[PDB]
Amino acid sequence: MSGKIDKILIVGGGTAGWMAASYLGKALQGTADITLLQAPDIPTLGVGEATHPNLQTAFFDFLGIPEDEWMRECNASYKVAIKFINWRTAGEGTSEARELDGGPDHFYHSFGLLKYHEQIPLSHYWFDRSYRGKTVEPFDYACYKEPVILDANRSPRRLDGSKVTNYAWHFDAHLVADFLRRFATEKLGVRHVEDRVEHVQRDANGNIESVRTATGRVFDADLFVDCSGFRGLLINKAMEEPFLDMSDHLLNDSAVATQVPHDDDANGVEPFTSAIAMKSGWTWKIPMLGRFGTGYVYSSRFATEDEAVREFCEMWHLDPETQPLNRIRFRVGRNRRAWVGNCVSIGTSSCFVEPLESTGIYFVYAALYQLVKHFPDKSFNPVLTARFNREIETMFDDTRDFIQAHFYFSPRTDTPFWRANKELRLADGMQEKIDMYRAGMAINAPASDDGNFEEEFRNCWNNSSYYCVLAGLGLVPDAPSPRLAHMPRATESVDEVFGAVKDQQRNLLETLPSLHEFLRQQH
Amino acid sequence: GKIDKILIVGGGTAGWMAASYLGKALQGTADITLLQAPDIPTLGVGEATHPNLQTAFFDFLGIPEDEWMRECNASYKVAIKFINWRTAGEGTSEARELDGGPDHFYHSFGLLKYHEQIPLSHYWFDRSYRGKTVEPFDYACYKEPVILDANRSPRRLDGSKVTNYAWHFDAHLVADFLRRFATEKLGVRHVEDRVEHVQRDANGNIESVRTATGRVFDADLFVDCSGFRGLLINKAMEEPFLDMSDHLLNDSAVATQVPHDDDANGVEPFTSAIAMKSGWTWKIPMLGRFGTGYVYSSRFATEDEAVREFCEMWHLDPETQPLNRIRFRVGRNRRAWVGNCVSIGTSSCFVEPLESTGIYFVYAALYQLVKHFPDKSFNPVLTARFNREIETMFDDTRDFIQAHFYFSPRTDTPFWRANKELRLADGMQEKIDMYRAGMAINAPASDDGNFEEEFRNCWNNSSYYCVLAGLGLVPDAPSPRLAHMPRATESVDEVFGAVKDQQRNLLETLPSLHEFLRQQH
Ligand SMILES: Cc1cc2nc3c(=O)[nH]c(=O)nc-3n(C[C@H](O)[C@H](O)[C@H](O)COP(=O)(O)OP(=O)(O)OC[C@H]3O[C@@H](n4cnc5c(N)ncnc54)[C@H](O)[C@@H]3O)c2cc1C
Ligand SMILES: Cc1cc2nc3c(=O)[nH]c(=O)nc-3n(C[C@H](O)[C@H](O)[C@H](O)COP(=O)(O)OP(=O)(O)OC[C@H]3O[C@@H](n4cnc5c(N)ncnc54)[C@H](O)[C@@H]3O)c2cc1C
């Protein structure tokens, strides 16, 4: 008809559903009735989530929830980077970095800012000097202060609370889902109903009229938010929207994961996510308090579940026959359209990719940001739906492209998995970015090098991220940027810029507490 | 190796902007020569500009605003004032009456305030749609219209800047200024000669240019600044020019310079775009004079009809007024940069100056050329990535300008009716759909100098509202979000009130632009 949305039904009560309830509860507050339907499900182990800095500025801040309120309640730790281990060297799946050229085979994709120098990113000066043999230092150690302090498990804040670098969070998603469920029901008036969808009623325009639950209750709404996970009960099963499998870009479709106890008093806490290259995939390590989550993401085309269970358990010296394990088969890809008619998918009902760059929770609140930006009324103007679906489809495919490049540009050829990855095609948009990168250009350079989710959303994979991963793996431009041969003042003074980085490395290495000591003081 | 030698063909405004920008960007690492032939000079009919002329061009050169402004007799521009685009009638310089008021509206450089993450325009239309206001969009949401109605200065007499502004000037004077700067301070070689023959090698790149006196010039990079002739890019390199008169009917102009008593009438701090029967007429106020030109469509008026309509409006004698008559090419090259040849200026692209883009296109392109600067291998990714930046820069402006005519309510002449039968480009038609659905179009990331941000967000939500709501195209209904933000819609009363205060305080304390202009001399 027309008028404002009066009633919203969220189907699904995991992390996405309760993020959707809390974000919509706050954004529309007092002007819509929100109900969430969640059925009891077999519980899983807390295998860990790694996040991005704008989890605080785009989500919890929007809720009005200060970082310390949700941190203490969710037993969270700090993330300063992803550390990529053994992506360039042949061998078994092990937690120890092999040796490369006199050093450990690792590199960092950190959250630090890449400094500009005369309107040109430090990455271009680094490669100019490396190409001409004036340096042999790796890109991440040359252009960021973080690698040196992450090697020493430093805290990102000083013990007086001073923040010295940008950081994200490690936590158990189950605890955040519980925190938000309490927040949404107790403070935003979201109705929780424990029930299982049995039938979805569609009208002759193809919109959802009502959902009937197994107890016979009927829920009607103006807007239906599908947060039912991989099953996609609304968007795929009721609305019949196709899912785009994207196995021609991403071979990984499975995981085996668990949680491992950890003596933080004996070993400290690593302030980073580890992505550890394996024979047929890669393994995440997400440090938490007293434990770490870990999971082997692998490709069913190259390893059986038993082979993956054994490789994963042997690597951590666990018993394959008795270790409590989550065995998962992922749905990799996205719906053809995220929002159809009066049904909006949020979470893995919408899209999923392996967590190689910690996008799972980002995709939820980014989409929720896009839903409110494009919020309809009961007439459901099709431009709003089309302009949202465009944003979701670009957010995902860009991430898909970026992640594929982690495997496509690895030098490894030792197993059928790493060799097969080089036989897939990059998407046209990705290949153009590579052409630019090889031609010495920045890729999606940030407008500034200095909170604003719209800028972050469009430049989420920027020039710093592409250099960190591509140069980390050893793909570097064909030759230096031609604009540097005409800027001898710039290339002569940039020595001071790298020197400022080394000073920060040595000063922060000398004065920062261990992440363990700071975590200990925060309790 | 790196580029050693650059030859610029063409010494108008574009050529000398190219010489100064490249001379500055490459200084000490390339030899630049500019080839310019003696040509019949034209009247200075005036140029209107954008605020980043200072931050993207003169600041890059190291030339402070007061140095070039005073030496080029420039005046200040705060907005374009659109006159009589909603009312039938002859070409007259005075706003007809619409609905209890004059038929004008402003597209200003001011920033649209945000309110709880949402542009003030959305609240304005919500209240106007719900009948809680009848104020036009520009007077409700900007401080500028009130002080522009009173020809106020954008800076106080102590220099305090009160609003964003750009410049009106005679381009020939800025071109002279830049020729002196490039030759005297950047070492650019000036040669007065006429190109007679261009030699191409077997890959189709330019080898050398031979002049009428028999001199031969070679280079690594050739910059075509030869205007509508495209001697390098179109004639020598054979790159097709894409005519785009299926979006823009205007292809001609008759223009002049008219003396003006500033002591009796002050100086208008805005460009006027005055609707005509078969086009529109610009007015660019300068010191003691204004440039003016009737931009019209040859398919709807003869040159004589246009000369008469233009001369009568300004009470000029067609038989004794000095008039420039021009027929331009509307559109752009298929590619701006081909092989070792880069077009800058009207050799590259041209559109009527309805939104003062002419000089912008030059330094925007020069920025992109340096950003994509090649070496002698001419990496094709660099050329393709430059060509793509130029073609969206142009096509976007083309679409925005077409919408000034397409959404005019007028139906009184074949010209205004014909504009409504053209097609909008698919991208513009999507932008219109968003606008009707209550969305912002290309909202500024912030509401607070950075050309990369300015370049991609050049036609943003304020500009679309100023023009579309100016002409009377408004969304189908208020933004659905506002019905869910009752705190925001109740506190926005204050936001409008702050604008009204700023309006009344500046109207009473600002000097006339004339008074500020006189203090600057
Ligand atoms: C096993 C797994 C591990 C992951 N690990 C990581 C990681 O380590 N790092 C990272 O960045 N991202 C990770 N992700 C991705 C990301 O974290 C999640 O996709 C994101 O949190 C959204 O998940 P979800 O709640 O939408 O899906 P789910 O957690 O599967 O939600 C399922 C919910 O749907 C509801 N539901 C289902 N059927 C019904 C029904 N008939 N009736 C009523 N309710 C129903 C239920 O309430 C149920 O709780 C992982 C995803 C999965 C599936
Ligand atoms: C009539 C006209 C009016 C305009 N009005 C406005 C306005 O009101 N507002 C706005 O914003 N923009 C306006 N513009 C656009 C803007 O002014 C232009 O971008 C810029 O001012 C002129 O670009 P140009 O130097 O490349 O063209 P031109 O000045 O025409 O370039 C011609 C140069 O090329 C040289 N040359 C040509 N052929 C040869 C040859 N064989 N050998 C040697 N030298 C050669 C000539 O010697 C000459 O120096 C207008 C443009 C034109 C043409």
Domain containing residue A228: CATH number: 3.50.50.60
CB B148 within 8 A of CB B162: no
A360-373 and A15-27 helices, crossing angle to 10°: 30
Q: CA B323 to CA B321: how far, in whole Å?
A: 6
Q: A474 — alpha (psi -120 to 50), left (phi > 0) or beta?
A: left
Q: How far is CA B366 from CA A269, B51, B361, in A?
A: 51, 17, 9
Q: How far is CA B275 from CA A325, B269, B372, B415, in A?
A: 75, 19, 40, 11
Neighbours of A182 (CB within 10 A): 12
Residue of B77, B143, B277, B431 marked active site: B77
Contact A439 B381 (CB under 8 A): yes
Q: Which of A9, A41, A199, A230 to mutate to test the pocket of ligand 1 (most atoms within 8 A of CB)?
A: A41
CB B182 within 8 A of CB B57: no
Neighbours of A469 (CB within 10 A): 23
Going by alpha carbons, the residue nearest to atom 42 of ligand 1 is A196
Nearest by Cα to B298 from B345, B349, B254, B255: B254
Q: What is the DSSP letter of A10?
A: E
Residues of A in contact with B29 (CB under 8 A): 485-488
CB A97 within 8 A of CB A86: yes
Q: CA B210 to CA B214: how far, in whole Å?
A: 6
Q: Of the ligands numbered here, which is closest to the C-alpha atom of B195? A: 2
Produce one character per residue of A123-161: b if its CB has 16 or more CB atoms within 10 Å, e if not: bbbbbbbbeeeebeebbbbbbbbbbbbbbebbbbbeeee
DSSP string, A233-301: IIIIIIT-PPEEE-TTT----EEEEEEEE--HHHH---SSEEEEE-SSEEEEEEE-SSEEEEEEEE-TT
Resolution of the solved structure (Å): 2.6
Q: CA B314 to CA B354: how far, in whole Å?
A: 19
Q: Of the ligands numbered here, which is closest to the C-alpha atom of B212? A: 2
* Lookup: tokens for A341: 């008619």
Q: CA A515 to CA A517: how far, in whole Å?
A: 6
State the structure-solving technique.
Answer: X-ray
Cα A44 to chain centroid distance, Å, stands at: 20
Q: How far is CA B433 from CA A19, B18, B172, B251, B440, in A?
A: 30, 39, 42, 29, 11
Cα B182 to averaged position of ligand 2 atoms, centre (Å): 18
Verify whether ligand 2 is closer than 6 Å to residue B282 (CB atom).
Answer: yes
Neighbours of A502 (CB within 10 A): 14
Q: What is the maximal distance between C-alpha atoms in chain A?
A: 76
CB A75 within 8 A of CB A288: yes
Within 13 Å of residue A450, how many CA atoms lie on the same side as its CB?
Answer: 6
CB B367 within 8 A of CB B56: yes
Q: Which of residues 401-440 of A touch B (CB under 8 A)?
A: 435-436, 438-440
Map tokens 């704008």 to a residue: A54
DSSP string, B55-84: IIIIHHHT--HHHHHHHHT-EEE-EEEEES
Residue B271's φ and ψ, nearest 5 degrees, are -80, 135
- B117, closest residue in chain A (CA to CA): A373
For chain B, helix, strand, coil in percent to 5 are 40, 20, 40
Contact B381 A5 (CB under 8 A): no
Q: CA A157 to CA A508: how far, in whole Å?
A: 10
Going by alpha carbons, the residue nearest to atom 19 of ligand 2 is B358
Contact A486 B433 (CB under 8 A): no
* Cβ-based neighbours of B191, under 8 Å, separated by 6 or more: B33, B34, B35, B36, B211, B215, B217
Nearest by Cα to A176 from A268, A262, A72, A278: A72
Q: What is the DSSP letter of A321?
A: T
Q: CA B253 to CA B358: how far, in whole Å?
A: 15
Counted across chains A and B, CB pairs separated by less than 8 A come out at 86
Long-range pairs, A216-221, Cβ under 8 A, ≥24: A217/A193, A219/A9, A219/A35, A219/A37, A219/A193, A220/A7, A220/A9, A221/A7, A221/A8, A221/A9, A221/A35
Cα B170 to averaged position of ligand 2 atoms, centre (Å): 13
- A374, closest residue in chain B (CA to CA): B439
DSSP string, A424-457: SPPPHHHHHHHHHHHTT--SS--S-----HHHHH
3-state secondary structure A112-143: CCCCEECCEEHHHHHHHHHHCCCCCCCHHHHH
CB A198 within 8 A of CB A214: yes
Q: What is the maximal distance between C-alpha atoms in chain B?
A: 76
CB B297 within 8 A of CB B422: no
Nearest by Cα to A39 from A184, A219, A192: A192
Task: Closest CB to A483: pick one of B370, B445, B452.
Answer: B370
Residue A443's φ and ψ, nearest 5 degrees, are -110, 115
Map tokens 């980077």 to a residue: A81
Nearest by Cα to A421 from A438, A445, A433, A404: A404
CA distance between the termini of chain A = 54
Q: CA A255 to CA A48: how far, in whole Å?
A: 13
CB A50 within 8 A of CB B502: no
Q: CA B368 to CA B387: how far, in whole Å?
A: 9
* Cβ-based neighbours of A377, under 8 Å, separated by 6 or more: A2, A3, A4, A5, B477, B480, B483
Q: CA A275 to CA A291: how far, in whole Å?
A: 17
Task: Closest CB to B437: pick one of A383, A438, A441.
Answer: A383
CB B281 within 8 A of CB B313: yes
Long-range pairs, A383-389, Cβ under 8 A, ≥24: A383/B430, A383/B433, A383/B434, A383/B436, A383/B437, A383/B439, A384/B437, A384/B439, A384/B480, A385/A337, A385/A339, A385/A340, A387/B434, A387/B439, A388/A338, A388/A339, A388/A344, A389/A337, A389/A338, A389/A339
DSSP string, A33-84: EEEEEE----------EE--THIIIIIIHHHT--HHHHHHHHT-EEE-EEEE
Q: What's the one-letter identity of residue A494? A: V
Strand bridging mode B31-36 / A223-226: unpaired
Residue B286's φ and ψ, nearest 5 degrees, are -120, -160
Partnered with residue B210 across adjacent β-strands are B197, B216
Q: What is the DSSP letter of B1?
A: -
DSSP E strands: which ranges in A325-402? 326-329, 333-335, 339-340, 343-345, 351-352
Q: CA A332 to CA A255: how far, in whole Å?
A: 12
Q: CA A267 to CA A200: how far, in whole Å?
A: 52
Residues of A in contact with B485 (CB under 8 A): 31
CB B313 within 8 A of CB B92: yes
Structural domain range at position B440: 1-521
Q: A68 — alpha (psi -120 to 50), left (phi > 0) or beta?
A: alpha
Verify whether ligand 1 is closer than 6 Å to residue A403 (CB atom).
Answer: no
Q: Of the ligands numbered here, which is closest to the C-alpha atom of A199? A: 1
Strand bridging mode A223-226 / A343-345: parallel
* Lookup: tokens for A155: 């805290």
Residue A33's φ and ψ, nearest 5 degrees, are -95, 120
What is the dihedral sign for C-alpha B22, B28, B32, B38? positive
- B476, closest residue in chain A (CA to CA): A381
Report the alpha-carbon angle A88-A92-A98, nearest 5: 45
> Over the Cα atoms of chain A, what is R_g?
23
Q: How far is CA B488 from CA A63, A377, B115, B481, B494, in A?
A: 16, 18, 7, 10, 10
Q: Of the ligands numbered here, which is closest to the C-alpha atom of B294? A: 2
Q: CA A270 to CA A292: how far, in whole Å?
A: 10
Contact B437 A486 (CB under 8 A): no
Verify whether ligand 2 is closer than 6 Å to residue B44 (CB atom).
Answer: no
* Cβ-based neighbours of A238, under 8 Å, separated by 6 or more: A200, A202, A208, A343
Cα B385 to chain centroid distance, Å, stands at: 23
CB A392 within 8 A of CB A20: no
Q: CA A266 to CA B354: how far, in whole Å?
A: 71
CB B304 within 8 A of CB B333: no
Q: Which ligand 1 atom is at minimum distance from the Cα of A48?
A: 8
Kindly state whether A448 is in contact with chain B, defined as any CB-CB distance less than 8 angstroms: yes
Q: What's the one-letter identity of residue B272? A: S
CA distance between the termini of chain B = 49
Neighbours of A497 (CB within 10 A): 17
Partnered with residue A108 across adjacent β-strands are A83
What is the dihedral sign for C-alpha B405, B275, B119, B487? negative
* Lookup: tokens for B105: 């509206």
For chain A, helix, strand, coil in percent to 5 are 40, 20, 40
Contact A377 B480 (CB under 8 A): yes
Kindly state whether A447 is in contact with chain B, defined as any CB-CB distance less than 8 angstroms: yes
Q: How far is CA B67 from CA A296, A382, B54, B520, in A?
A: 65, 53, 11, 11
Neighbours of A492 (CB within 10 A): 9
Verify whether ligand 1 is closer than 6 Å to residue A281 (CB atom).
Answer: no
* Cβ-based neighbours of B13, under 8 Å, separated by 6 or more: B47, B171, B172, B174, B175, B178, B345, B359, B362
Element (H, E) at A200: strand A197-202
Strand bridging mode B324-327 / B341-343: unpaired
* Cβ-based neighbours of B428, under 8 Å, separated by 6 or more: B399, B400, B402, B403
Within 13 Å of residue B46, how many CA atoms lie on the same side as its CB?
Answer: 33
Going by alpha carbons, the residue nearest to atom 17 of ligand 1 is A360
Q: How far is CA A50 from CA A170, A195, A417, A523, B12, in A?
A: 5, 30, 25, 22, 58
Q: Is B24 a catalytic residue?
A: no
Verify whether ligand 2 is closer than 6 Å to residue B353 (CB atom).
Answer: yes
Residue A198's φ and ψ, nearest 5 degrees, are -110, -25
Neighbours of A429 (CB within 10 A): 11
Count of domains in chain A? 1
Q: CA A61 to CA B446: how far, in whole Å?
A: 18
Q: Which of A174, A179, A228 to mutate to test the pocket of ligand 1 (most atoms within 8 A of CB)?
A: A228
